[PDB]
Design a protein around this motif. Structure first.
Motif, PDB file in Angstrom:
ATOM      1  N   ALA A  34     -33.934 -64.510  14.565  1.00 22.57           N
ATOM      2  CA  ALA A  34     -35.114 -63.762  14.128  1.00 22.57           C
ATOM      3  C   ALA A  34     -36.253 -64.683  13.674  1.00 22.57           C
ATOM      4  CB  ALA A  34     -34.745 -62.784  13.015  1.00 22.57           C
ATOM      5  N   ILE A  35     -35.910 -65.783  13.005  1.00 20.30           N
ATOM      6  CA  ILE A  35     -36.910 -66.749  12.559  1.00 20.30           C
ATOM      7  C   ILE A  35     -37.647 -67.330  13.767  1.00 20.30           C
ATOM      8  CG2 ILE A  35     -37.240 -69.068  11.550  1.00 20.30           C
ATOM      9  CD1 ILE A  35     -34.998 -68.274   9.511  1.00 20.30           C
ATOM     10  N   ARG A  36     -36.882 -67.819  14.739  1.00 19.69           N
ATOM     11  CA  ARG A  36     -37.447 -68.346  15.980  1.00 19.69           C
ATOM     12  C   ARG A  36     -38.272 -67.292  16.716  1.00 19.69           C
ATOM     13  NH1 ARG A  36     -32.300 -71.798  16.426  1.00 19.69           N
ATOM     14  NH2 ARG A  36     -31.292 -69.774  16.826  1.00 19.69           N
ATOM     15  N   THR A  37     -37.764 -66.065  16.743  1.00 17.65           N
ATOM     16  CA  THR A  37     -38.415 -64.972  17.455  1.00 17.65           C
ATOM     17  C   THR A  37     -39.792 -64.646  16.866  1.00 17.65           C
ATOM     18  OG1 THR A  37     -36.234 -64.056  18.045  1.00 17.65           O
ATOM     19  CG2 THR A  37     -38.114 -62.594  18.321  1.00 17.65           C
ATOM     20  N   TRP A  38     -39.856 -64.437  15.552  1.00 16.06           N
ATOM     21  CA  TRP A  38     -41.120 -64.067  14.884  1.00 16.06           C
ATOM     22  C   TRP A  38     -42.093 -65.237  14.754  1.00 16.06           C
ATOM     23  CZ3 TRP A  38     -42.118 -59.306  15.343  1.00 16.06           C
ATOM     24  CH2 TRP A  38     -41.105 -58.337  15.244  1.00 16.06           C
ATOM     25  N   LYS A  39     -41.560 -66.454  14.703  1.00 13.26           N
ATOM     26  CA  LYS A  39     -42.387 -67.654  14.715  1.00 13.26           C
ATOM     27  C   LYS A  39     -43.151 -67.795  16.040  1.00 13.26           C
ATOM     28  CE  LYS A  39     -44.155 -71.644  13.753  1.00 13.26           C
ATOM     29  NZ  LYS A  39     -45.417 -71.627  12.976  1.00 13.26           N
ATOM     30  N   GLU A  40     -42.501 -67.440  17.144  1.00 14.07           N
ATOM     31  CA  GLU A  40     -43.159 -67.449  18.449  1.00 14.07           C
ATOM     32  C   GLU A  40     -44.335 -66.462  18.472  1.00 14.07           C
ATOM     33  OE1 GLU A  40     -40.756 -66.128  21.814  1.00 14.07           O
ATOM     34  OE2 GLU A  40     -41.841 -67.461  23.179  1.00 14.07           O
TER      35      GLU A  40
ATOM     36  N   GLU B 158     -39.724 -62.833   5.365  1.00 13.86           N
ATOM     37  CA  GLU B 158     -38.466 -62.229   4.911  1.00 13.86           C
ATOM     38  C   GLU B 158     -37.231 -62.719   5.691  1.00 13.86           C
ATOM     39  OE1 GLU B 158     -39.112 -57.924   4.668  1.00 13.86           O
ATOM     40  OE2 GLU B 158     -39.977 -58.131   2.668  1.00 13.86           O
ATOM     41  N   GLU B 159     -37.391 -63.085   6.961  1.00 13.37           N
ATOM     42  CA  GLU B 159     -36.267 -63.652   7.732  1.00 13.37           C
ATOM     43  C   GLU B 159     -35.878 -65.031   7.206  1.00 13.37           C
ATOM     44  OE1 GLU B 159     -36.490 -60.400  10.650  1.00 13.37           O
ATOM     45  OE2 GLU B 159     -35.453 -61.172   8.902  1.00 13.37           O
ATOM     46  N   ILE B 160     -36.885 -65.810   6.810  1.00 11.28           N
ATOM     47  CA  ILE B 160     -36.687 -67.107   6.168  1.00 11.28           C
ATOM     48  C   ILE B 160     -35.893 -66.928   4.874  1.00 11.28           C
ATOM     49  CG2 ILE B 160     -37.893 -68.956   4.902  1.00 11.28           C
ATOM     50  CD1 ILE B 160     -40.169 -68.566   7.084  1.00 11.28           C
ATOM     51  N   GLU B 161     -36.251 -65.904   4.099  1.00 11.59           N
ATOM     52  CA  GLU B 161     -35.524 -65.567   2.876  1.00 11.59           C
ATOM     53  C   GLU B 161     -34.097 -65.139   3.193  1.00 11.59           C
ATOM     54  OE1 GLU B 161     -38.388 -62.718   1.230  1.00 11.59           O
ATOM     55  OE2 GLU B 161     -38.531 -64.016  -0.547  1.00 11.59           O
ATOM     56  N   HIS B 162     -33.935 -64.287   4.201  1.00 17.03           N
ATOM     57  CA  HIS B 162     -32.601 -63.847   4.611  1.00 17.03           C
ATOM     58  C   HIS B 162     -31.715 -65.029   5.008  1.00 17.03           C
ATOM     59  CE1 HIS B 162     -34.210 -59.552   5.764  1.00 17.03           C
ATOM     60  NE2 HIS B 162     -34.376 -59.844   4.488  1.00 17.03           N
ATOM     61  N   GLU B 163     -32.255 -65.955   5.797  1.00 19.33           N
ATOM     62  CA  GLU B 163     -31.489 -67.137   6.215  1.00 19.33           C
ATOM     63  C   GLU B 163     -31.050 -67.930   4.998  1.00 19.33           C
ATOM     64  OE1 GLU B 163     -31.642 -71.185   9.008  1.00 19.33           O
ATOM     65  OE2 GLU B 163     -33.364 -70.601   7.800  1.00 19.33           O
ATOM     66  N   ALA B 164     -31.990 -68.122   4.079  1.00 24.74           N
ATOM     67  CA  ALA B 164     -31.759 -68.857   2.845  1.00 24.74           C
ATOM     68  C   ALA B 164     -30.640 -68.247   1.998  1.00 24.74           C
ATOM     69  CB  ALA B 164     -33.048 -68.923   2.054  1.00 24.74           C
TER      70      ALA B 164
END
Ligand SMILES: [Fe+3]
Ligand SMILES: [Fe+3]
Ligand SMILES: [Fe+3]
Ligand SMILES: [Fe+3]
Ligand SMILES: [Fe+3]
Ligand SMILES: [Fe+3]
Ligand SMILES: [Fe+3]
Ligand SMILES: [Fe+3]
Ligand SMILES: [Fe+3]
Ligand SMILES: [Fe+3]
Ligand SMILES: [Fe+3]
Ligand SMILES: [Fe+3]
Ligand SMILES: [Zn+2]
Ligand SMILES: [Zn+2]
Ligand SMILES: [Zn+2]
Ligand SMILES: [Zn+2]
Ligand SMILES: [Zn+2]
Ligand SMILES: [Zn+2]
Ligand SMILES: [Zn+2]
Ligand SMILES: [Zn+2]
Ligand SMILES: [Zn+2]
Ligand SMILES: [Zn+2]
Ligand SMILES: [Zn+2]
Ligand SMILES: [Zn+2]
Lengths: 168, 167, 169, 169, 169, 169, 167, 167, 168, 169, 168, 169
Positions: free
Chosen positions: L122-128, L150-156
């Motif tokens: 998701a991080i890679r996807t939304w970053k694109e 929020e995906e960055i937070e989720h990964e964290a």
């Protein structure tokens, strides 16, 4: 005309929907008249004797108005309606008119009227439960809910008239 | 300074000094009511007086807010409250709502409450009559107060006698 | 003998006919009660895609008119009056004609016409009460004025729907 | 057809000139809208340590006057009137003179003078409306009276700041 | 019969003079009630641009002192005492001197001086009550301590305004 | 070996007998639990028009006493104590006599007497805890003081009902 | 200026300079706790430390409010906070709650938290003893704080050892 | 006085006088929208226009808040609103949203609303382009506003034509 | 004595009201003891193992106290009462006393006790449902509601003790 | 193993120097924490009638800057950085000079000067972070931009007080 | 394996729990797909005709998502689970896919799809009620609750398509 | 012919390929929908005393990802795109691999691994999406940036559980 599947599932059970709606209307009519008649009864719970009793009669009045609103919706869902004239509604009411008694200055006279109205409602909604039991989940649930509050209302007035414990 | 909120009243031929004088006397009664109803409420005791306390309490708190409400208006009209609190007591529109002698009978307390409310009704009705058609601000506030005094009288009338009213 | 009611005495000093006032109040308040019933049925029959948005406007009027009943009923008892003993009496003495469901109700304009006529009657009814209490009875006037204020709004709502006449929200 | 508007009929029966009333309402309501604009600027320029506490009092007046505009605009349309088509027309028919930022605005008393004069005009303006609707139009009277009530408060606020004259809070 | 009041008995066991305590409570509570009246007037006269920000601080003290009156009045009756029959008696037995509007009230520092002196008296008054109830009467002590706490805050507010002395917010 | 509990060490330095304190706390807290049960039954039997208004006063006491149980239970465990293993133990070690429904309960004064006696016992019970913790254990004292404060209020309520003795609200 | 809130304390023979000095050192520890507990909470990681974070968070936020609470009182008594933030760190009543070396073991972090709380208990208890029977305001605030430090210690005692406490 | 919030923009080579001029014209359009949408909403009458009123109402109220929002920023940048309200009308970024002649057809009103929103989109997009990579504060506020103008256009597009959008 | 129509409608069904009240009292007694015993059990869910478990036991404790309040009202509505003595209540409880186990420092020992208490409650309230089913709408609804939460409570502890999925 | 952190990878792909970014974030976030301490003292000393209204503006900045610290601290750890072990290290690496109480603090303008200089430094500090993360790190940019936004507001508040320069509210 | 008393009380009644769970999963799957498909259907209720209809479709969509959340919990309580793959879920759905119709610009075409979905749900949840009636109080209550809202949803769309009165 | 959509025209002027953008948006938004389903199952199987605390973290991610679906779906339709007609299409075009329950799910680390991998995608996807809309499409960029945040937070969150890596709360 349109296919109403909410009705079809009831007909499959063998439930007489015209008879059920007719009972709902009479029961619901009694709730509406209660809203009117309990207004007057509450007004006349006066003096230092009647002061604390007003709020108990008020609670019943307002809850019974919501019983009217609740079951009215269901009547129309089943393809019924309320009477065209308000006087018709009064005449088909499941219960006797909860008139202000003659010696109303004795609050026990008022409590007797309230108690009799509530006892009639208990019998009325219990009949609806018996008919819809095992056939009409929606009507049963609403009627059971209402019955549940009428039992509480009777218990309130029984506690005031007689010394019989109940609730709060 | 030019005070236009006052000028519009003067144009109507309203006697502002007389109006403010009435407002101060009426407002003073609201302040004493807040004190005296405290004591009257305290003594509504026993199982007879228990339910009565909250009705006397509602009146007491509403009357204190009547004091707050009209006090603002008195100063807007260029008037003021008496310098000494004892002056305020003396110029009160109403008689002092003293605790009666046989206060253990709650009807005695209710009689005192009722008389105080009846005086307030007459007091604020007089203010309404003077400001009627001349002073929209003072009329509205006085009308509002009068409206609650009528309700207060109705409460105590229902308790003392068997006379229906409200809730 | 009978209790002194000073909230009534101040009215009598003005020359206000209290028996006549209470009578008008009862008939006006009776119409608010029947409105609550009749608007229920009228709202229920605002169906289809045409009538969908109209339901909530009729609902707002219904609920506000029920509160008008609650509001003025209190005042009637304060003045030493009372509601009719029988609910059928109440219906009969109502200031307004019964807001019956019209025959061609599937046309929502037919329902709107009935709502409009009921509101128009209420405006006239509460305006009369305002005229009588004006400069004599501050409490009754204020309550009657408030109610009238909302009936004017109700009329404006239905005028905007039936005709293209601008009003409010 | 042209519709029957009973909320208007009851006013006509009193002998109230509705065209004249609506004209006064529009001019008074226009002044509220310009107040909302001009008080923005006046508030912005209540600067320094002298003007800091004055901002929130000017803010309160501004926002309350914007709600006065909203309030009476509804009533104008209920009476069958409207706001001017053009916003420049609105400015020109305003009941009050434009509340321009004064030249020596860095003296906050110069700003307070402008605010005070605007409020004093509003008091006279809404008092006139009260006098016209008094005993004839309960709805318009009540609304105008409510607004007048707040303009009296606003004048009292600025009188207390400019001069040492007690008022409210 | 005269009833057993155990909430009083536990105090008597400590050797606490209850008649003397109640007398002090009444005089202290009387000062709160007069504060509520006098601070009204003092707040009204904190005018101009100098006094504008000071009003809300005087307002806060006023309202908090009114709640002090309500708080300790309850306790007086729990201890079997009462408020004076007459309101004039209350004024006369007040623990503090009357907080009259000063002559040169247009100088807000004159008003602040009066406020400060009233608070300083309250501090001494409630501190005495704390000293008497300390280790004997937990309920009265806790209430008196709570009030004292706010009087200390009130004094600190006015000390910060009159002089440049830091305190709170 | 066993953990260092500094919240307990500071008490031991004062010479406070913690085992004896915890014992008193458990017996006091046990009485709060039984109150919650017994007041339920007492409240249920405040029937008729005489007892109707009394129910909510008994209810308030019941619910507040259940929160006293919750409050001091936490503290007992903080001090390294615990509640009795068996609920029957709790009943038996209660500081107060069982608040049984009286025989002539249909006289509400009989119920009020039982409520009053329970509260009077609670006052004595929590006052003892205050005396022990006074000047040694700030946490236990504060909690016990708070509870005592409400028991005094509870007694005052029932004294006002049984006798004509003024108190609170 | 005459400060009567101070005079009433002086009459009791309370050394106010000594009291304020203790208050500043105790309050300074609350401020450093707010900083150090931030780092300690961050490092309560993994599945072991996940539930522990919120308990450390609750302590951190409550201790910051202890700082706010007693800071007000210090100024009321005529005292002040140190001019430099480094001074505050140095005069802290407690040792610096540094992140331990083997912080990946959450028990190491809990030990540091527990020691900090235990120091705070002793610190605020001393303040209570001095103000007891002399300074009702300072005593009440110190007592309140002490009350929460006792709870905080109990939390960490329950986590480190199996010792029951609260919730 | 040194205004560092302005200096950081000047370093980026941003023309602040030109920016403020655009902001004033864009903000002026928001103010006129608040006036003109009032009249447009009033005339969405009948059973056709009943559901449309609240959508026009939502736009009107949001656009008034756009005026409030960017007005603050104009003064932060050292600019100001026009002295006269008529000047504001004249320098508006958008044409006057007059009530159309055949307003009883609600589609006529919707056309006027749609054109006003489309102008606002172009207006605030221009501001975003200028502040992009130079002025984070103004960009963020302009972006936020633009975001709501896009939504407003989508609402009226969905009503006029059958074009899906939102809620 | 007074006519209680809320009771009459039940008697018409053939429902034994003395037997029902007796079952309600025993069931309701178990709820009250649960409120006590779960206090102690929750206190002793200590350490880093037990920390997250406390709030799940807390939720059950508080919900079971409300089950006591709920069905107590109904007992009195039916003309029954709670035992005069609190010790009687403990002795007639439908369930075995949920004592703190000996090796409580193992939180699984505590969870076993909680689980057994909840399983007893499920059987207890299910019995009440079976009796009131088709006769007493009010009692059935309240008992069904309670049963519903006991099923959830059992599911919570089953998920902790064993790896069995349930809820949240 | 050392874990794959994709939230960091996406930044590295942009050519962003993460060690340099984290270092700047720590120095900027350190200045927020010292602000929270120093603004406490500065607020305390905004005394007298001159400084009274200024306290709440300094209070608002203080509390908002504390939330800036909380906000960016989270982001520092997400990027694999940390706060300094010692609190004294934090003070030393602060992006801004220590906001010490000035010598003539009784002149509130002296305090306002210190506040203004601190805010002006923060603006430059967070603007640098925006320039680095612009077009590379959406999360850090958004947070830094949000903070910068409030620092611009804070500077505007103090500029309006010190000089007569309009801003906000 | 562990004793699950919440399940044992059902088995005593003779209730086939595997068959019940299988029916619950298919019913619950239909709720999840409804949440998806009603999103699209609501989006396409455009123009001045469709504007007021969007919020009625929105209400149904959101309530059906909560029906998914509600009965999912119960499935796991009974020892069942959701399908491992989301595509499996779609394939076992009790109802036909509520696709956007071809002439969607006529909002009546959309309303027909919504109506058919709701009618399927009524039959589906009514079947669950019939199975759990008198055996499984928890499942019956939840299924009855859901059924109750599906009846309302059908009534909403019947009122829009045809001129049939219902509710609000 | 077809309506003028100015919200789209301003994007086209930037040279943005809207068909390509919408395609990426649909695939990204599809992954948010499947997340909502798959995380339900993953959360359900975080059982035992090990997994108890992990449930609410997985729950938070699930509910936030469902709101990401709601958020970007609105935007897709604003751009003239749409969701796939069939729900099976949606599953197949998802930007991310299906987050299936792992085989050894009773080890909660196995579930955490699946959650982590989904978030990383998701991080890679939304970053694109951010990279494409950066400097061209403010509305899509802002929404995509928020989601990414929020995906960055989720990964964290899941990195902190699986490994000992510090993040947030
Ligand atoms: Fe009833
Ligand atoms: Fe009064
Ligand atoms: Fe009406
Ligand atoms: Fe104004
Ligand atoms: Fe004071
Ligand atoms: Fe008690
Ligand atoms: Fe701590
Ligand atoms: Fe717009
Ligand atoms: Fe349970
Ligand atoms: Fe700042
Ligand atoms: Fe549905
Ligand atoms: Fe996610
Ligand atoms: Zn009923
Ligand atoms: Zn009064
Ligand atoms: Zn009406
Ligand atoms: Zn105005
Ligand atoms: Zn005081
Ligand atoms: Zn207690
Ligand atoms: Zn602390
Ligand atoms: Zn706009
Ligand atoms: Zn239970
Ligand atoms: Zn900052
Ligand atoms: Zn559903
Ligand atoms: Zn997501």
């Amino acid at each position: 005309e349109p296919k109403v599947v909410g009705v079809e599932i009831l007909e499959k059970s063998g439930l007489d929907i015209k008879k059920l709606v007719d009972k709902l209307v009479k029961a619901t009519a009694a709730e509406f008249t209660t809203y009117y008649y309990y207004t007057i009864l509450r007004m006349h719970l006066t003096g230092m004797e009647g002061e604390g009793l007003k709020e108990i009669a008020e609670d019943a009045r307002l809850e019974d108005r919501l019983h009217f609103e609740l079951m009215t919706q269901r009547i129309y869902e089943l393809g019924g309606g309320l009477p065209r004239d308000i006087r018709q509604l009064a005449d088909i009411s499941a219960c006797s008119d909860a008139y202000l008694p003659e010696n109303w200055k004795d609050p026990k006279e008022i409590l007797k009227v309230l108690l009799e109205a509530e006892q009639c409602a208990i019998r009325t909604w219990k009949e609806v439960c018996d008919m819809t039991y095992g056939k009409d989940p929606r009507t049963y649930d609403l009627a059971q809910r209402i019955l549940q509050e009428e039992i509480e209302h009777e218990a309130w007035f029984l506690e005031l008239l007689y010394g019989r414990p109940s609730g709060h």
